[PDB]
Amino acid sequence: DWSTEALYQVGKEFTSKMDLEKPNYIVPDYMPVVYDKLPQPPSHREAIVNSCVFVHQTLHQANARLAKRGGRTMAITPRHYLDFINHYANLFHEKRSEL
Amino acid sequence: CLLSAAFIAYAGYFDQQMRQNLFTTWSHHLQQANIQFRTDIARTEYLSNADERLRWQASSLPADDLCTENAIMLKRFNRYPLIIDPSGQATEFIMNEYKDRKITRTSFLDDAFRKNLESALRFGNPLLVQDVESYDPVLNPVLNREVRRTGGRVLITLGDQDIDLSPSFVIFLSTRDPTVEFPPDLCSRVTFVNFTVTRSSLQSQCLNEVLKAERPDVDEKRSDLLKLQGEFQLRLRQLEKSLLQALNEVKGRILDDDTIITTLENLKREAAEVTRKVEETDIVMQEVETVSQQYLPLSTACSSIYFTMESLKQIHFLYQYSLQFFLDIYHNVLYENPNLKGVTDHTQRLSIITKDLFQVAFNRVARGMLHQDHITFAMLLARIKLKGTVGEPTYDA
Amino acid sequence: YGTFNRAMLRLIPSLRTYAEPLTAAMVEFYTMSQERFTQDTQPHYIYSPREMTRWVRGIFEALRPLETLPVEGLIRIWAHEALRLFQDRLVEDEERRWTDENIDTVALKHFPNIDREKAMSRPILYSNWLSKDYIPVDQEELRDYVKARLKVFYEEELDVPLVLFNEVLDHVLRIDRIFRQPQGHLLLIGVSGAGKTTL
Numbered sequence: 064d065w066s067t068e069a070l071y072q073v074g075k076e077f078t079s080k081m082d083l084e085k086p087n088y089i090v091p092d093y094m095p096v097v098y099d100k101l102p103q104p105p106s107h108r109e110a111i112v113n114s115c116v117f118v119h120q121t122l123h124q125a126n127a128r129l130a131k132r133g134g135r136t137m138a139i140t141p142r143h144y145l146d147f148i149n150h151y152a153n154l155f156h157e158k159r160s161e162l
Numbered sequence: 163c164l165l166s167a168a169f170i171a172y173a174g175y176f177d178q179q180m181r182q183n184l185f186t187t188w189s190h191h192l193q194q195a196n197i198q199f200r201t202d203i204a205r206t207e208y209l210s211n212a213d214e215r216l217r218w219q220a221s222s223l224p225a226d227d228l229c230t231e232n233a234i235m236l237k238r239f240n241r242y243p244l245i246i247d248p249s250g251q252a253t254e255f256i257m258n259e260y261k262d263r264k265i266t267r268t269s270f271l272d273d274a275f276r277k278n279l280e281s282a283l284r285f286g287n288p289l290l291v292q293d294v295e296s297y298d299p300v301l302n303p304v305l306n307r308e309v310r311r312t313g314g315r316v317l318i319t320l321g322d323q324d325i326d327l328s329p330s331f332v333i334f335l336s337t338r339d340p341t342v343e344f345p346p347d348l349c350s351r352v353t354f355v356n357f358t359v360t361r362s363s364l365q366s367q368c369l370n371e372v373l374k375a376e377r378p379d380v381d382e383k384r385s386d387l388l389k390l391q392g393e394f395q396l397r398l399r400q401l402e403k404s405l406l407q408a409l410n411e412v413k414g415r416i417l418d419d420d421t422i423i424t425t426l427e428n429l430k431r432e433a434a435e436v437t438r439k440v441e442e443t444d445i446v447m448q449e450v451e452t453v454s455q456q457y458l459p460l461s462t463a464c465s466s467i468y469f470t471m472e473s474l475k476q477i478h479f480l481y482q483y484s485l486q487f488f489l490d491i492y493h494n495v496l497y498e499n500p501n502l503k504g505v506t507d508h509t510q511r512l513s514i515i516t517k518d519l520f521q522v523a524f525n526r527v528a529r530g531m532l533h534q535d536h537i538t539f540a541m542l543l544a545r546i547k548l549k550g551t552v553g554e555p556t557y558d559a
Numbered sequence: 560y561g562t563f564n565r566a567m568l569r570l571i572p573s574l575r576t577y578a579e580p581l582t583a584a585m586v587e588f589y590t591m592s593q594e595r596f597t598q599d600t601q602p603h604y605i606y607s608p609r610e611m612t613r614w615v616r617g618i619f620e621a622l623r624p625l626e627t628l629p630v631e632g633l634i635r636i637w638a639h640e641a642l643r644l645f646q647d648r649l650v651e652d653e654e655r656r657w658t659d660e661n662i663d664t665v666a667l668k669h670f671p672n673i674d675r676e677k678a679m680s681r682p683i684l685y686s687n688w689l690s691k692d693y694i695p696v697d698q699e700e701l702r703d704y705v706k707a708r709l710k711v712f713y714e715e716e717l718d719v720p721l722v723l724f725n726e727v728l729d730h731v732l733r734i735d736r737i738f739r740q741p742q743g744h745l746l747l748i749g750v751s752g753a754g755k756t757t758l
């Protein structure tokens with residue numbers, strides 16, 4: 064299955080055409096989800112990608128915990144991550160367009 | 163948008179409580195990383211509109227928030243959904259929503275399932291396929307959304323032959339047994355939406371219904387606060403554009419000035435209240451939160467008693483009870499209570515409702531029970547009440 | 560395999576002296592690989608002398624057109640074959656590491672007078688695309704070549720974008736290596752959607 068750095072790279076590449084704000088963005092990140100993060104304080108785009116891969120990791124953790132408490136869990140695949148990225152792109156474009 | 167997309171793509175198979183846990187975990191992480199996202203976002207409202215919600219309600223959809231989230235998922239999906247529905251309400255809603263687009267109904271065990279498939283595929287007809295346990299692998303090229311381009315067409319390889327995709331072929335897979343598992347390959351290519359009721363979902367349903375019946379003023383006030391996000395803001399846009407239309411139509415006829423002044427005053431007044439509504443956005447929340455907390459024990463008792471009734475099957479095969487049965491019991495004790503007339507206190511009515519709920523549930527259940535297990539059901543009800551009541555040790559040991 | 564190693568290193572006399580150390584290191588690692596990774600952990604953790612035969616065969620194929628190779632190159636080929644034979648099928652990262660440190664320490668123990676070129680070149684990627692023969696290649700050159708090939712392939716067929724992260728490059732190299740030999744039957748096992756059919 065895809066590792067954390069693969070998830071970060073694919074999120075970075077597919078969210079490239081997302082014209083993200085990149086504002087001043089104070090960075091009290093302190094989140095070592097990916098160890099190849101920029102030592103200098105990451106921009107808004109990279110923080111969003113890190114949050115995306117963190118959401119995927121949290122879904123995996125939730126599935127593990129649910130399986131612990133009596134199963135009834137369904138597998139999550141990289142296709143789920145791709146669908147999530149596509150939903151992010153489409154919804155962000157739609158929301159920005161109407162605003 | 164990131165939170166909404168995460169909710170849409172990932173959540174859908176989990177129940178209400180687990181969805182809330184995932185949402186609050188993502189929100190806590192996002193606010194920790196100083197990512198600017200609006201707090202207390204109603205994902206039910208942020209992803210839909212008032213007209214769509216009322217159309218869903220009029221097209222045989224339950225008023226539960228879980229059902230509205232499921233409808234949102236059924237509207238904003240990149241992978242065709244797999245509706246898990248122990249009841250039949252979701253299928254009724256999906257037919258009622260796509261009736262104008264001649265939605266064809268079929269099943270995986272239908273001998274003419276294939277013919278019905280390219281029949282809808284050719285003409286872009288939405289297709290509802292049920293009984294997905296006996297899944298047909300022939301849908302694999304369809305679910306993967308693979309397309310081939312030839313001469314300006316879009317062809318799909320439905321078997322050895324090729325069929326054009328057509329503009330809009332939206333298929334809806336569904337089943338009826340919640341306790342079914344699928345191989346991960348099918349699970350990866352399908353959007354999971356679950357209509358199964360659980361403890362948290364029924365607790366939310368009961369809390370919403372009791373807030374609708376008792377204390378309607380708080381219920382609408384919470385509705386006004388929820389609609390404060392986009393509904394009023396969008397609603398006044400129509401008045402502003404109508405003001406623009408009136409200004410261009412009149413061409414500066416100040417002679418009938420009062421006329422325009424009329425709507426001008428409107429654009430004043432409905433503005434202020436909206437701005438006014440912004441001010442008490444916070445203070446109303448603690449009031450609604452306290453009112454909901456007041457009625458929480460009744461909802462927890464309702465969920466516990468319903469699930470005890472459902473699990474009563476294991477003592478005897480004769481003890482079969484449906485969710486509609488408990489809903490009927492709740493509606494009878496809430497709207498047809500002889501003891502509730504002539505008393506208006508908003509704190510004694512709740513106690514009377516709880517006592518009569520327990521009593522009428524016992525009366526309606528024990529009549530279909532042998533006279534050797536009434537004591538068991540009464541003991542379970544007493545234990546549930548003891549857990550629910552406040553001020554007493556649980557005596558777990 | 561002592562006889563096989565001596566016959567294999569006849570391609571150049573500068574490597575024959577290391578035939579016995581190479582055989583000893585090859586057997587030692589295998590024994591360790593057979594000591595761990597038992598059957599009762601995963602249903603496909605078997606390690607027969609067939610692995611050794613595939614090992615010496617792959618090394619011989621790599622050395623067939625190459626000539627005047629230093630000892631470090633031979634150790635690099637040996638390590639690459641060991642990685643491609645004894646850790647491709649591992650299912651957890653901890654065992655992948657265990658294999659990495661164990662191959663490193665076996666090579667260090669049986670070759671204490673060699674450079675550590677393989678240590679810096681940890682990826683250990685061999686390909687025959689940039690060069691005619693089977694020469695090890697750099698990560699970035701391989702990534703650029705695969706990017707150009709993907710740019711061509713997008714319009715060629717299956718216009719679906721892909722991202723080139725390192726695991727994709729490693730898997731592409733492995734599948735190409737298997738496809739080269741005229742018996743290659745592949746069994747890609749993994750989570751559905753990770754990129755088996757596409758790659």
Ligand SMILES: Nc1ncnc2c1ncn2[C@@H]1O[C@H](COP(=O)(O)OP(=O)(O)O)[C@@H](O)[C@H]1O
Pocket residue numbers: 073142145719720721722723724727750751752753754755756757758
């Ligand atoms: N390296 C990659 N980069 C980007 N997307 C990928 C990659 N590998 C696979 N995918 C995605 O996976 C989908 C196809 O998955 P597939 O290869 O059929 O999985 P499986 O082989 O497990 O069935 C494609 O839509 C593609 O977007």
